[PDB]
Ligand binder design. Structure first.
Ligand SMILES: Nc1ncnc2c1ncn2[C@@H]1O[C@H](COP(=O)(O)OP(=O)(O)NP(=O)(O)O)[C@@H](O)[C@H]1O
Ligand SMILES: Nc1ncnc2c1ncn2[C@@H]1O[C@H](COP(=O)(O)OP(=O)(O)NP(=O)(O)O)[C@@H](O)[C@H]1O
Lengths: 572, 572
């Protein structure tokens, strides 16, 4: 029940395997009563049954076994492997999704590696536990149930020995079990870190070469790798001494039987009938119990694992939700005295900031490399659901709106763009339906000045791109990121320094293209190369987390207030 | 021997565990002969030995067992878990390193996820195999050796049955074994892909939200996850039917004994002495063999795994090597008619390109967003060890030089910069020795216009940065990447569009800083914002994979050849 219990819910839909495998167990039990009912007799009494028994019962061994034994063995493996494989893969399925249901700074804090690990490794653990362990915890479990209810009344004297050591083996084992849950848990995170250190290794290849520390890396790894072999070794050894100690408690109630057989049987009451069955039943029961211990380890490993990720899944959906779902979008972006800071208790990266970007209009964000530009940029699309103030899209605040469509009401080109490992078409197509017309993309790639090189590379939009635009120019990439963002075609379009690395001529080319389209929609462009703002409906000069000037390329320039300054630095 | 064999080398240094665990096995065997030499007698003959036997031999059961049994159980677990834990973690250790010993487009082609996976998952497999399997393949293995040499001469008649089914069970099993090696192998890659799809998930979070396809992702995952539960299930079921089929061959030679016991024993020669021991020995031998099968599975899983990564490690060190190791570096970069293309058979991204950058001089790379700029940039530091031509640092070609110091002869600021998850200090410090003076960095961060914001954020250089500069501005990051690259202080410095996203004023600030330092060293700056080139010792205008103009801001401008064009587009 309880934690264990809370896991049965996800196993429930798969219980058909549990039962079918338990029924397979039973049938092999029957196959044993018959295999005993032929093997021992033809043993010594062999030349005593050499005719009728011998001959006529040979084809019943091959059939008794093949049929029952064989088909039942494959009934067990059959339904057991199945019940686990599904609960495991269905487990990791549930996390994956929950993971991305973790909006915000979650992904900011911990290394992606630890998360990645959780899916892979943690799920696998809880898997083995559910299947093979439930089968034996109920098998050797029911074996212990029969032997204790047997010695119970059948020999109330020796059962007064079981009621002195049963609670002692049970308590000593409950404890070793908690250190099992724990040692495995830590064993997990460790495995997780092995991952992280491995990701960095690869992700940072370029660096690591000129870096001048490939070995500094080797070192970091050896330390983590090792902390793994020893993390686990820690548990395995803890489990090894765990067995012989329980043998002690077993060999204790059993030796107690020998002490009461020297005096109490020499007082009858035990005789050669009970000093045979109560003792044989003792030396027997200690075996299935001293097996349930060795497998308990594995059951814990997984159980503990369940609870780790049971919890990670029980975490909080950083995806707060509103209600109002809109399909239309006149991009009437508006937000007042919105103040903002990142992980809670620190110093605001954006103070009392008021601003309105009416539909069709183009508002720009320029300021010192460090003012909340990119911040507010991403803050529009709720990535941080605010600090204190009001941000509303058409009179309605982001919250009033459903995160879902809200984010469907905007296209973006993040300062540094991230891409996938598909085809050009796709990296653009993976932009809402993931399947539009070959036209839209053809067009988008063109109205993004890129159809020329797309076509230069064989396979065109069908060409495989570098994992995160690795096998091609950043400009090319950026353009493509602009492509994607342009094709989607939203009412509110944010281009966070979308020019970043561009052939000046090519740049201005897009600029023209932009003007042509953005002429209707609401556009919020935030770049540094002023050249692409001189003709914006309004420019928001912002420094040190706070806005300082709203004006036309003209007003600003004339005003000589830090914008002008930058427009001076413009050249020289 | 062979593949299996080739793995023993890495297990060798750990064989002390193998032997100590085998000696522990033996000792438990002796503990069994004595446990039989007390348990059966006190069984029925209990009230027949109720005094001397009973009493005086009880403390020898508790000691016989505790001592031998207990200490031997912990001797087995002890040395076995150890031998594996080391061979596994030492395995993944060897790959990790080899992995980064894979210079070039390796990391370009396949998803980092697959590699990451290999370490984690593949190593674990070969681990279990080595330990638990070698123990039982030699245990149940030697058990089969004794039973076959026994029935051998002891009953040459029934041994003429073993020499009819032994080769049949052996061949049927050798085959199931190959499908074990295979099904596990594919099972691996699958697990690998589960990883990749999971990485993308997280890495692409930002996207995936505005993306508008969180569920498209869910779908991709379910398909891979599932392909996993079924990949493995495929093997497990294949193993399940594998057992009952071998039971068939066993139940075959055994039933043959019953057929020759009805007529041949009824011809003596077998009688009730041999129709008891040869048959008992038969029904016995089929058990340890029908166990070696079930564990063989696990042994294969790992064996196959060894060979997968045995090979991945046996791959080619894309790190070709030279000989000449230099410590000094007057940055005399020089290279003629060097042509270059990427993955072999395609169209050159750099043609006959000749260029010399003499020590102290500053050569710039500008051209259309698509010309081999970043390419040659990275080509200097050998990342692609060339196509056809000559690139030499001080008369000596890159090859003549040792990759090692060669890359130590240069500092770089890649178009898009990659960072780690340490402290500011470190992301800069991880730049050769990984431990310099607090000054150098203080200075580097300053002479990189960044000490101001570094100090604005609490903990300063001791502050924890975002996994790959996530929790701070790209400008800030870029500057830091410049920091790192600046502190190292090399003779040849390449700044690939190092300004990318910078506060114009801040930009020019660095520019000044650059001039001050680069005044002595050899500097190759390749940007787009021309403003930071107007005063370069020479500007290399390059378009469509080929150079087209070498001249001063002046000559070029005056010449009116595509450079001027760009310098016109400069504004407007
Ligand atoms: N995750 C974070 N945690 C704390 N502070 C942050 C975080 N992200 C950004 N900041 C702060 O916000 C500013 C950087 O972000 P932002 O203002 O969005 O950059 P940006 O406008 O793109 N600047 P730049 O890239 O230099 O043009 C600085 O004041 C940072 O200290
Ligand atoms: N790994 C690669 N495999 C194949 N082609 C590549 C690869 N990397 C770059 N290219 C080609 O080389 C050019 C892009 O690289 P490069 O010329 O270095 O960019 P760049 O000069 O930095 N351009 P930009 O970033 O736009 O200023 C294009 O013609 C690409 O198709």
């Amino acid at each position: 029940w309880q934690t264990f219990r809370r896991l049965w819910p996800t196993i429930a839909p798969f219980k058909a395997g549990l039962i079918v495998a338990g029924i397979a167990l039973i049938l092999n039990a029957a196959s044993d009563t018959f295999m005993l009912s032929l093997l021992k007799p033809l043993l010594d009494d062999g030349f005593g049954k050499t005719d009728r028994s011998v001959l006529l019962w040979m084809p019943l061994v091959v059939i008794g076994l093949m049929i029952l034994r064989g088909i039942t063995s494959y009934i067990s493996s059959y339904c057991i492997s199945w019940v686990s494989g599904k609960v495991v893969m269905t487990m990791r399925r549930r996390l994956f999704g929950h993971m991305m249901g973790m909006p915000v700074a979650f992904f900011d804090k911990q290394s992606t590696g630890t998360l990645l690990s959780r899916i892979t490794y943690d799920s696998e653990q809880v898997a083995s536990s559910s299947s093979g362990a439930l089968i034996t915890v109920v098998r050797e479990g029911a074996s212990i149930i029969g032997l204790f209810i047997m010695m119970f009344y059948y020999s109330w004297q020796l059962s007064i020995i079981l009621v002195v050591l049963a609670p002692i083996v049970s308590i000593a084992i409950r404890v070793v079990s908690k250190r099992f849950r724990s040692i495995s848990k830590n064993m997990q995170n460790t495995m997780g870190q092995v991952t992280t250190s491995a990701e960095q290794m690869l992700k940072g290849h370029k660096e690591v070469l000129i870096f001048g520390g490939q070995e500094v890396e080797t070192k970091r790894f050896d330390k983590v790798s090792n902390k793994m072999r020893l993390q686990g070794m820690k548990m395995v050894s803890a489990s090894s001494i765990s067995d012989p100690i329980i043998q002690l408690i077993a060999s204790l109630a059993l030796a107690f039987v020998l002490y009461a057989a020297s005096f109490p049987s020499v007082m009858d009451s035990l005789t050669a009938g009970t000093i045979t069955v109560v003792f044989s039943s003792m030396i027997a029961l200690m075996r299935p119990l001293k097996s349930l211990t060795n497998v308990n380890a594995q059951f814990q490993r997984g159980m503990a694992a369940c609870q780790t990720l049971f919890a990670i899944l029980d975490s909080e959906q950083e995806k707060d939700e509103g209600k109002r779902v809109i399909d239309r979008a006149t991009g009437d972006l508006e937000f007042r005295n919105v103040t903002f800071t990142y992980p809670g208790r620190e110093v605001p990266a954006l103070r009392n900031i008021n601003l309105k970007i009416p539909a069709g209009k183009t508002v720009a964000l320029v300021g010192r490399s460090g003012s909340g530009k990119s911040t507010i940029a991403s803050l529009i699309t709720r990535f941080y659901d605010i600090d204190e103030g009001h941000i509303l899209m058409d009179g309605h605040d982001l919250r009033e709106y459903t995160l879902a469509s809200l984010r469907n009401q905007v296209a973006l080109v993040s300062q540094n763009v991230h891409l996938f490992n598909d085809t050009v078409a796709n990296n653009i197509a993976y932009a809402r339906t993931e399947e539009y017309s070959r036209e839209q993309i053809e067009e988008a790639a063109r109205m993004a000045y890129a159809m020329d090189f797309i076509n230069k590379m064989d396979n065109g939009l069908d060409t495989i791109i570098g994992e995160n635009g690795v096998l091609l120019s950043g400009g090319q990439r950026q353009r493509i990121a602009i492509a994607r963002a342009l094709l989607r075609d939203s009412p509110i379009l944010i281009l966070d320094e979308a020019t970043s690395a561009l052939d000046t001529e090519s740049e201005r080319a897009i600029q023209a293209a932009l003007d042509e389209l953005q002429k209707n929609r609401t556009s919020l462009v935030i770049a540094h190369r002023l050249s692409t703002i001189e003709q914006a409906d309004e420019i928001v000069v912002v420094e040190d987390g706070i806005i300082v000037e709203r004006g036309t390329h003209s007003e600003l320039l004339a005003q000589h207030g830090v914008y002008a300054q930058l427009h001076k630095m413009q050249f020289g």
